[PDB]
mmCIF file of C-alpha atoms in Angstrom:
data_model
loop_
_atom_site.group_PDB
_atom_site.id
_atom_site.type_symbol
_atom_site.label_atom_id
_atom_site.label_comp_id
_atom_site.label_asym_id
_atom_site.label_seq_id
_atom_site.Cartn_x
_atom_site.Cartn_y
_atom_site.Cartn_z
ATOM 1 C CA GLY A 61 53.672 -22.207 38.153
ATOM 2 C CA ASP A 62 51.972 -19.687 40.461
ATOM 3 C CA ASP A 63 52.206 -15.960 41.027
ATOM 4 C CA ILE A 64 53.279 -13.953 44.116
ATOM 5 C CA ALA A 65 50.977 -11.300 45.441
ATOM 6 C CA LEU A 66 52.336 -8.922 47.996
ATOM 7 C CA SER A 67 50.149 -6.629 50.021
ATOM 8 C CA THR A 68 49.824 -4.774 53.241
ATOM 9 C CA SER A 69 46.876 -4.128 55.460
ATOM 10 C CA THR A 70 47.975 -0.743 56.722
ATOM 11 C CA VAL A 71 47.487 2.859 55.759
ATOM 12 C CA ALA A 72 50.314 5.162 54.875
ATOM 13 C CA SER A 73 51.253 8.345 53.078
ATOM 14 C CA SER A 74 53.690 6.265 51.159
ATOM 15 C CA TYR A 75 54.811 2.702 50.934
ATOM 16 C CA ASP A 76 58.292 1.502 49.993
ATOM 17 C CA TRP A 77 58.781 -2.170 49.098
ATOM 18 C CA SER A 78 61.971 -3.906 48.077
ATOM 19 C CA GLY A 79 63.105 -7.430 47.285
ATOM 20 C CA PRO A 80 64.668 -10.136 45.097
ATOM 21 C CA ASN A 81 65.610 -9.262 41.532
ATOM 22 C CA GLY A 82 65.328 -5.603 42.366
ATOM 23 C CA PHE A 83 61.677 -5.840 43.134
ATOM 24 C CA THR A 84 60.534 -2.318 43.790
ATOM 25 C CA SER A 85 57.111 -0.941 44.592
ATOM 26 C CA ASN A 86 55.273 2.056 46.012
ATOM 27 C CA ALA A 87 51.755 0.890 46.822
ATOM 28 C CA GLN A 88 49.714 -0.873 49.450
ATOM 29 C CA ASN A 89 49.028 -3.250 46.562
ATOM 30 C CA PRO A 90 52.187 -3.834 44.495
ATOM 31 C CA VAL A 91 51.897 -5.245 41.036
ATOM 32 C CA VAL A 92 51.640 -8.993 41.299
ATOM 33 C CA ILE A 93 54.749 -10.907 40.343
ATOM 34 C CA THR A 94 53.722 -13.484 37.822
ATOM 35 C CA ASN A 95 55.232 -16.790 36.774
ATOM 36 C CA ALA A 96 57.314 -16.722 39.886
ATOM 37 C CA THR A 97 60.564 -18.580 39.671
ATOM 38 C CA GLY A 98 63.422 -19.484 41.969
ATOM 39 C CA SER A 99 64.907 -16.016 41.638
ATOM 40 C CA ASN A 100 61.730 -14.497 43.042
ATOM 41 C CA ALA A 101 62.210 -16.318 46.295
ATOM 42 C CA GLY A 102 63.646 -14.411 49.162
ATOM 43 C CA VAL A 103 62.691 -11.743 51.611
ATOM 44 C CA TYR A 104 60.408 -8.912 50.708
ATOM 45 C CA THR A 105 60.759 -5.855 52.910
ATOM 46 C CA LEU A 106 58.269 -3.049 53.562
ATOM 47 C CA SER A 107 58.571 0.289 55.287
ATOM 48 C CA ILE A 108 56.046 3.122 55.426
ATOM 49 C CA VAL A 109 55.696 6.839 55.988
ATOM 50 C CA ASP A 110 52.929 8.175 58.247
ATOM 51 C CA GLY A 111 50.467 11.043 57.743
ATOM 52 C CA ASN A 112 52.830 13.421 59.445
ATOM 53 C CA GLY A 113 55.944 12.468 57.495
ATOM 54 C CA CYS A 114 57.546 10.137 60.115
ATOM 55 C CA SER A 115 58.976 6.849 58.908
ATOM 56 C CA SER A 116 58.370 3.397 60.344
ATOM 57 C CA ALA A 117 60.540 0.530 61.257
ATOM 58 C CA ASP A 118 60.670 -1.969 58.446
ATOM 59 C CA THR A 119 59.120 -5.421 58.534
ATOM 60 C CA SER A 120 59.513 -8.324 56.168
ATOM 61 C CA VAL A 121 58.124 -11.592 54.816
ATOM 62 C CA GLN A 122 59.893 -14.696 53.550
ATOM 63 C CA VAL A 123 58.475 -16.061 50.329
ATOM 64 C CA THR A 124 59.679 -19.288 48.829
ATOM 65 C CA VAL A 125 59.054 -20.883 45.470
ATOM 66 C CA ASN A 126 58.629 -24.617 45.102
ATOM 67 C CA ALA A 127 59.589 -26.551 42.015
ATOM 68 C CA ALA A 128 57.653 -28.990 39.872
ATOM 69 C CA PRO A 129 58.992 -32.331 38.645
ATOM 70 C CA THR A 130 60.644 -32.349 35.263
ATOM 71 C CA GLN A 131 58.789 -33.338 32.143
ATOM 72 C CA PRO A 132 57.749 -37.010 32.592
ATOM 73 C CA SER A 133 57.760 -39.694 29.912
ATOM 74 C CA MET A 134 54.834 -41.875 28.787
ATOM 75 C CA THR A 135 54.625 -45.389 27.348
ATOM 76 C CA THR A 136 51.450 -47.177 26.290
ATOM 77 C CA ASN A 137 50.344 -50.389 24.622
ATOM 78 C CA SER A 138 49.407 -48.319 21.571
ATOM 79 C CA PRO A 139 48.815 -51.007 18.841
ATOM 80 C CA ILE A 140 45.571 -52.009 20.504
ATOM 81 C CA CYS A 141 42.513 -53.932 19.213
ATOM 82 C CA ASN A 142 39.114 -52.605 20.218
ATOM 83 C CA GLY A 143 37.892 -54.419 23.288
ATOM 84 C CA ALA A 144 41.323 -54.943 24.757
ATOM 85 C CA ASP A 145 42.324 -53.053 27.875
ATOM 86 C CA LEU A 146 44.328 -49.914 27.252
ATOM 87 C CA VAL A 147 47.304 -49.588 29.550
ATOM 88 C CA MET A 148 49.436 -46.548 30.180
ATOM 89 C CA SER A 149 52.397 -46.000 32.428
ATOM 90 C CA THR A 150 55.190 -43.633 33.357
ATOM 91 C CA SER A 151 58.535 -44.033 35.065
ATOM 92 C CA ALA A 152 58.072 -40.650 36.667
ATOM 93 C CA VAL A 153 57.876 -40.347 40.419
ATOM 94 C CA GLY A 154 55.352 -38.186 42.210
ATOM 95 C CA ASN A 155 52.494 -38.022 44.628
ATOM 96 C CA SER A 156 49.802 -38.195 41.999
ATOM 97 C CA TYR A 157 49.588 -38.409 38.249
ATOM 98 C CA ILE A 158 47.402 -36.494 35.826
ATOM 99 C CA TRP A 159 46.369 -38.214 32.640
ATOM 100 C CA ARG A 160 44.863 -36.266 29.777
ATOM 101 C CA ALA A 161 42.733 -37.748 27.046
ATOM 102 C CA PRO A 162 42.745 -36.534 23.446
ATOM 103 C CA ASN A 163 39.346 -34.934 23.884
ATOM 104 C CA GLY A 164 40.220 -33.145 27.091
ATOM 105 C CA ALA A 165 38.895 -35.685 29.541
ATOM 106 C CA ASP A 166 41.043 -35.358 32.640
ATOM 107 C CA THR A 167 41.583 -38.059 35.250
ATOM 108 C CA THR A 168 44.083 -38.852 37.974
ATOM 109 C CA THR A 169 45.765 -41.811 39.597
ATOM 110 C CA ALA A 170 47.628 -42.462 42.811
ATOM 111 C CA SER A 171 50.265 -44.447 40.991
ATOM 112 C CA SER A 172 52.288 -44.529 37.836
ATOM 113 C CA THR A 173 50.013 -47.049 36.077
ATOM 114 C CA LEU A 174 46.598 -46.332 34.585
ATOM 115 C CA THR A 175 44.238 -48.683 32.837
ATOM 116 C CA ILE A 176 41.222 -47.943 30.703
ATOM 117 C CA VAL A 177 38.196 -50.160 30.473
ATOM 118 C CA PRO A 178 36.777 -50.389 26.895
ATOM 119 C CA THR A 179 33.408 -49.178 28.107
ATOM 120 C CA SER A 180 34.583 -46.000 29.810
ATOM 121 C CA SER A 181 34.699 -42.469 28.469
ATOM 122 C CA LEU A 182 38.481 -42.618 28.269
ATOM 123 C CA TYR A 183 38.790 -45.362 25.666
ATOM 124 C CA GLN A 184 39.974 -42.855 23.104
ATOM 125 C CA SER A 185 42.445 -43.097 20.273
ATOM 126 C CA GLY A 186 44.821 -40.229 19.550
ATOM 127 C CA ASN A 187 47.433 -38.274 21.484
ATOM 128 C CA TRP A 188 47.629 -38.812 25.251
ATOM 129 C CA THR A 189 49.677 -36.721 27.674
ATOM 130 C CA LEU A 190 50.749 -36.834 31.314
ATOM 131 C CA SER A 191 51.851 -34.425 34.003
ATOM 132 C CA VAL A 192 53.148 -35.186 37.490
ATOM 133 C CA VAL A 193 52.130 -33.669 40.782
ATOM 134 C CA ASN A 194 54.645 -33.557 43.610
ATOM 135 C CA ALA A 195 54.184 -33.164 47.358
ATOM 136 C CA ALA A 196 54.162 -29.385 47.149
ATOM 137 C CA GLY A 197 51.273 -29.468 44.720
ATOM 138 C CA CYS A 198 53.564 -28.308 41.879
ATOM 139 C CA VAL A 199 52.821 -29.810 38.478
ATOM 140 C CA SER A 200 55.363 -30.727 35.834
ATOM 141 C CA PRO A 201 55.166 -29.700 32.180
ATOM 142 C CA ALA A 202 53.148 -32.143 30.175
ATOM 143 C CA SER A 203 54.894 -35.024 28.477
ATOM 144 C CA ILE A 204 55.317 -35.518 24.794
ATOM 145 C CA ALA A 205 52.146 -37.063 23.579
ATOM 146 C CA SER A 206 52.011 -40.752 22.954
ATOM 147 C CA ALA A 207 49.677 -41.745 20.190
ATOM 148 C CA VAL A 208 47.247 -44.573 20.789
ATOM 149 C CA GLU A 209 45.606 -46.405 17.933
ATOM 150 C CA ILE A 210 42.492 -48.400 18.626
ATOM 151 C CA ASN A 211 41.728 -50.703 15.751
ATOM 152 C CA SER A 212 38.442 -52.089 14.588
ATOM 153 C CA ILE A 213 37.726 -55.790 14.356
ATOM 154 C CA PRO A 214 37.338 -57.207 10.815
ATOM 155 C CA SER A 215 34.734 -59.611 9.456
ATOM 156 C CA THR A 216 35.232 -63.332 9.035
ATOM 157 C CA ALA A 217 35.425 -63.658 5.215
ATOM 158 C CA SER A 218 33.661 -66.952 5.637
ATOM 159 C CA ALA A 219 35.593 -69.668 3.954
ATOM 160 C CA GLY A 220 34.336 -72.460 1.824
ATOM 161 C CA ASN A 221 35.725 -75.763 0.647
ATOM 162 C CA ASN A 222 35.853 -77.542 -2.684
ATOM 163 C CA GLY A 223 32.577 -79.375 -2.308
ATOM 164 C CA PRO A 224 32.386 -83.045 -1.428
ATOM 165 C CA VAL A 225 35.766 -84.643 -1.808
ATOM 166 C CA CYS A 226 36.129 -88.226 -3.071
ATOM 167 C CA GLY B 97 36.284 -12.725 30.651
ATOM 168 C CA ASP B 98 35.068 -9.151 31.214
ATOM 169 C CA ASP B 99 36.713 -5.803 31.809
ATOM 170 C CA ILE B 100 36.557 -3.431 34.820
ATOM 171 C CA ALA B 101 35.603 0.155 34.252
ATOM 172 C CA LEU B 102 36.127 2.571 37.065
ATOM 173 C CA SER B 103 34.656 6.032 37.090
ATOM 174 C CA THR B 104 33.453 8.825 39.249
ATOM 175 C CA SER B 105 30.573 11.193 38.892
ATOM 176 C CA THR B 106 32.190 14.155 40.583
ATOM 177 C CA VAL B 107 34.216 17.155 39.564
ATOM 178 C CA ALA B 108 37.677 17.840 40.839
ATOM 179 C CA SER B 109 40.903 19.683 40.169
ATOM 180 C CA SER B 110 42.577 16.349 40.396
ATOM 181 C CA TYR B 111 41.678 12.762 40.969
ATOM 182 C CA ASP B 112 43.871 10.138 42.625
ATOM 183 C CA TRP B 113 42.911 6.467 42.277
ATOM 184 C CA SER B 114 44.703 3.455 43.675
ATOM 185 C CA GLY B 115 44.166 -0.289 43.840
ATOM 186 C CA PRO B 116 45.133 -3.935 43.272
ATOM 187 C CA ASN B 117 48.273 -4.689 41.290
ATOM 188 C CA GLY B 118 49.396 -1.123 41.733
ATOM 189 C CA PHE B 119 46.491 0.252 39.827
ATOM 190 C CA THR B 120 47.100 3.954 39.556
ATOM 191 C CA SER B 121 45.113 6.665 37.837
ATOM 192 C CA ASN B 122 44.567 10.412 37.654
ATOM 193 C CA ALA B 123 41.266 10.946 35.864
ATOM 194 C CA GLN B 124 37.542 11.018 36.406
ATOM 195 C CA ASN B 125 37.645 8.249 33.803
ATOM 196 C CA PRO B 126 40.601 5.908 34.416
ATOM 197 C CA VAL B 127 41.769 3.647 31.666
ATOM 198 C CA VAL B 128 39.610 0.563 31.666
ATOM 199 C CA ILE B 129 41.223 -2.553 33.055
ATOM 200 C CA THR B 130 40.793 -5.252 30.489
ATOM 201 C CA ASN B 131 40.757 -9.028 30.722
ATOM 202 C CA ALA B 132 40.280 -8.704 34.423
ATOM 203 C CA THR B 133 41.575 -11.579 36.453
ATOM 204 C CA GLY B 134 41.598 -12.653 40.074
ATOM 205 C CA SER B 135 44.446 -10.283 40.855
ATOM 206 C CA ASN B 136 42.330 -7.339 39.746
ATOM 207 C CA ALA B 137 39.818 -8.032 42.457
ATOM 208 C CA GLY B 138 39.976 -5.950 45.550
ATOM 209 C CA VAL B 139 39.226 -2.473 46.720
ATOM 210 C CA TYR B 140 39.690 0.528 44.526
ATOM 211 C CA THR B 141 40.111 3.788 46.401
ATOM 212 C CA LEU B 142 39.511 7.355 45.211
ATOM 213 C CA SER B 143 40.321 10.720 46.704
ATOM 214 C CA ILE B 144 40.015 14.154 45.114
ATOM 215 C CA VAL B 145 41.283 17.705 45.310
ATOM 216 C CA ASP B 146 38.833 20.620 45.107
ATOM 217 C CA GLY B 147 38.965 23.851 43.087
ATOM 218 C CA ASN B 148 40.636 25.620 45.953
ATOM 219 C CA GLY B 149 43.313 23.014 46.619
ATOM 220 C CA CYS B 150 41.644 21.260 49.619
ATOM 221 C CA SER B 151 41.659 17.477 49.679
ATOM 222 C CA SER B 152 38.727 15.163 50.308
ATOM 223 C CA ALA B 153 38.166 12.174 52.433
ATOM 224 C CA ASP B 154 38.686 9.026 50.438
ATOM 225 C CA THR B 155 35.949 6.612 49.434
ATOM 226 C CA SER B 156 36.175 3.162 47.943
ATOM 227 C CA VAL B 157 34.483 0.377 45.989
ATOM 228 C CA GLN B 158 34.840 -3.389 46.239
ATOM 229 C CA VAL B 159 35.168 -5.120 42.899
ATOM 230 C CA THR B 160 35.242 -8.863 42.592
ATOM 231 C CA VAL B 161 36.047 -11.129 39.688
ATOM 232 C CA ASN B 162 34.160 -14.348 39.109
ATOM 233 C CA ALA B 163 35.651 -17.397 37.475
ATOM 234 C CA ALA B 164 34.483 -19.521 34.574
ATOM 235 C CA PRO B 165 34.427 -23.323 34.558
ATOM 236 C CA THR B 166 37.475 -25.053 33.187
ATOM 237 C CA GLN B 167 37.650 -26.264 29.629
ATOM 238 C CA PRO B 168 34.916 -28.936 29.236
ATOM 239 C CA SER B 169 35.192 -32.159 27.255
ATOM 240 C CA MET B 170 32.915 -33.362 24.435
ATOM 241 C CA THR B 171 31.908 -36.820 23.214
ATOM 242 C CA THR B 172 29.626 -37.568 20.277
ATOM 243 C CA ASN B 173 28.329 -40.511 18.283
ATOM 244 C CA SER B 174 30.550 -39.370 15.414
ATOM 245 C CA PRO B 175 30.468 -42.393 12.989
ATOM 246 C CA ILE B 176 26.917 -41.537 12.012
ATOM 247 C CA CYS B 177 24.782 -42.521 8.981
ATOM 248 C CA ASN B 178 22.665 -39.796 7.428
ATOM 249 C CA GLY B 179 19.177 -39.921 8.851
ATOM 250 C CA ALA B 180 20.245 -41.145 12.251
ATOM 251 C CA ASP B 181 19.968 -38.840 15.234
ATOM 252 C CA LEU B 182 23.159 -37.040 16.150
ATOM 253 C CA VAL B 183 23.862 -37.086 19.857
ATOM 254 C CA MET B 184 26.346 -35.008 21.781
ATOM 255 C CA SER B 185 27.176 -34.871 25.442
ATOM 256 C CA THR B 186 29.576 -33.522 28.030
ATOM 257 C CA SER B 187 30.509 -34.528 31.548
ATOM 258 C CA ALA B 188 30.924 -30.886 32.433
ATOM 259 C CA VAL B 189 28.729 -29.317 35.064
ATOM 260 C CA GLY B 190 27.115 -25.925 34.686
ATOM 261 C CA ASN B 191 23.937 -23.946 34.534
ATOM 262 C CA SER B 192 23.686 -23.979 30.775
ATOM 263 C CA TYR B 193 25.663 -25.320 27.868
ATOM 264 C CA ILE B 194 26.638 -23.650 24.616
ATOM 265 C CA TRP B 195 27.019 -25.820 21.562
ATOM 266 C CA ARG B 196 28.706 -24.515 18.445
ATOM 267 C CA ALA B 197 28.232 -25.927 14.985
ATOM 268 C CA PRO B 198 30.966 -26.057 12.350
ATOM 269 C CA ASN B 199 29.319 -23.279 10.381
ATOM 270 C CA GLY B 200 28.858 -20.985 13.343
ATOM 271 C CA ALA B 201 25.315 -21.910 14.235
ATOM 272 C CA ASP B 202 25.013 -21.390 17.973
ATOM 273 C CA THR B 203 22.490 -23.082 20.244
ATOM 274 C CA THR B 204 22.088 -23.790 23.937
ATOM 275 C CA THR B 205 20.751 -26.448 26.254
ATOM 276 C CA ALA B 206 19.721 -26.637 29.877
ATOM 277 C CA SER B 207 21.509 -29.926 30.312
ATOM 278 C CA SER B 208 24.629 -31.772 29.358
ATOM 279 C CA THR B 209 22.979 -33.715 26.509
ATOM 280 C CA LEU B 210 22.029 -32.337 23.103
ATOM 281 C CA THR B 211 20.400 -34.099 20.207
ATOM 282 C CA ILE B 212 20.097 -33.057 16.598
ATOM 283 C CA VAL B 213 17.210 -33.960 14.369
ATOM 284 C CA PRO B 214 18.308 -34.818 10.774
ATOM 285 C CA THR B 215 16.031 -32.136 9.392
ATOM 286 C CA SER B 216 17.334 -29.236 11.459
ATOM 287 C CA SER B 217 19.935 -26.643 10.569
ATOM 288 C CA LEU B 218 22.398 -28.218 12.980
ATOM 289 C CA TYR B 219 22.790 -31.577 11.259
ATOM 290 C CA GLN B 220 26.294 -30.667 10.189
ATOM 291 C CA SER B 221 29.430 -32.708 9.775
ATOM 292 C CA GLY B 222 32.786 -31.314 10.867
ATOM 293 C CA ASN B 223 34.271 -29.927 14.070
ATOM 294 C CA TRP B 224 31.902 -29.229 16.972
ATOM 295 C CA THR B 225 32.806 -27.358 20.153
ATOM 296 C CA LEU B 226 31.282 -26.651 23.558
ATOM 297 C CA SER B 227 31.578 -24.070 26.297
ATOM 298 C CA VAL B 228 29.971 -24.059 29.737
ATOM 299 C CA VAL B 229 28.117 -21.285 31.479
ATOM 300 C CA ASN B 230 28.106 -21.175 35.263
ATOM 301 C CA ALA B 231 25.787 -19.432 37.713
ATOM 302 C CA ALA B 232 27.751 -16.201 37.565
ATOM 303 C CA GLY B 233 27.300 -16.018 33.821
ATOM 304 C CA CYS B 234 31.017 -16.774 33.288
ATOM 305 C CA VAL B 235 31.816 -18.931 30.272
ATOM 306 C CA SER B 236 34.555 -21.526 30.042
ATOM 307 C CA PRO B 237 37.096 -21.762 27.225
ATOM 308 C CA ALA B 238 35.792 -23.813 24.369
ATOM 309 C CA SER B 239 36.499 -27.518 24.284
ATOM 310 C CA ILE B 240 38.707 -29.312 21.858
ATOM 311 C CA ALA B 241 36.639 -29.902 18.808
ATOM 312 C CA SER B 242 35.112 -33.272 18.237
ATOM 313 C CA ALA B 243 34.767 -34.195 14.616
ATOM 314 C CA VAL B 244 31.471 -35.576 13.397
ATOM 315 C CA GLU B 245 31.212 -37.512 10.174
ATOM 316 C CA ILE B 246 27.831 -37.888 8.567
ATOM 317 C CA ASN B 247 27.914 -40.559 5.919
ATOM 318 C CA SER B 248 25.819 -40.952 2.832
ATOM 319 C CA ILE B 249 23.682 -43.991 2.156
ATOM 320 C CA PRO B 250 24.834 -46.248 -0.722
ATOM 321 C CA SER B 251 22.793 -47.839 -3.498
ATOM 322 C CA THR B 252 21.533 -51.401 -3.491
ATOM 323 C CA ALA B 253 23.757 -53.011 -6.175
ATOM 324 C CA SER B 254 20.764 -55.099 -7.076
ATOM 325 C CA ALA B 255 21.662 -58.723 -7.022
ATOM 326 C CA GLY B 256 20.746 -61.398 -9.456
ATOM 327 C CA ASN B 257 20.710 -65.169 -9.400
ATOM 328 C CA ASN B 258 21.890 -67.859 -11.776
ATOM 329 C CA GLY B 259 18.673 -68.139 -13.726
ATOM 330 C CA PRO B 260 16.228 -70.977 -13.228
ATOM 331 C CA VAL B 261 17.829 -73.727 -11.228
ATOM 332 C CA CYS B 262 17.051 -77.396 -11.933
#
C-alpha cells in the first residue's frame, strides 16, 4: 500500500538507474514508484558518470514489498436494542484490528473481538467496516460493511382490566 | 493541498532545473507542480547558461510540504426539537475547526465544540460537515456528513372531559 522512493546522495554528470519491470531513470531523484506491488520488488541498480566523462562502478539496493492480509469478514449482533452491548467480531487473523464507525470514528483492538459500551462515542447504528494489520504493518482492504441497527425502546401501553369482577 | 511554483529572477540563454520525482524543466518559469505531496518535497536545483555559452554555478532551494490532519469525525445531538440548542462536536485535535452548514454557510471555532442558537443563520437541518485546521494552516479532508433533523412542534389536541361527573 506504500510507494518506493529511490534516490542517491551523490553528484554526477549523469545518472543511470535500472530495475524491476524495466524501471528506468536518469536523475539523482527518480520519479517515485507508486502503489508498489510484488513486481516492483527486486534490485535497483545505479551507475554514474563523472564531471570528466568517466564512468563509475555500479552499486545496488534490494527493495522488497510486503503484503497485506486479504479482505477480512465481519459479523455483529446487529438486531440490537438500545442499552444492550454491541458486539463485533472477525475470524481474520492479524496483529491488530482496525474498526471503523459509520461516522468515521476510528478505533483499534489487540484481538478479533470488540465491544461497545452504550455510553461511548462508538454506539452508532449504520454500516461498520474492518481492516486487518499484520506484523509488517501492512493493512488489508476494508471488509464489506455490516449494518447495525440500534432500536429504540417502546412505551408501556399501560393496560387496564374490566373493573371490579364479581 | 497547495501547489509549488518554482521560478527564477534571472536571464539566461537556457535554464536547467532538476528535483524530486525527476522534476525537470527548461524555463525561467517551470510548469507549476500541482497538488504537491510529500514526494515533491526536497531540494530543487537550478543552473543556467549565459549569452555567450558559459555555464553557471548551480544554486538551490529547499521546499517542504506540510501535512493536514486526517479526516475528522463529527457527532451531533441530531434528534432535535425546534427551539432547542443545536450542539456539535468532534474528537479531532487542531488549532481551529471549520464547520459547514447544509446551505454552504461557513463558520469557525477555536475549539472542538460548536453550538447553534435557534435564531441564527446556522440553525439548519440536513447534512453537516467538518474539517480541521492544524498549526501549519493545512486543512483535513471533510468529515462524513452527520445529518441533523430539526422537528416542528405539534399542536395541543385540546382535551375534553365527560361533562359534569356525579
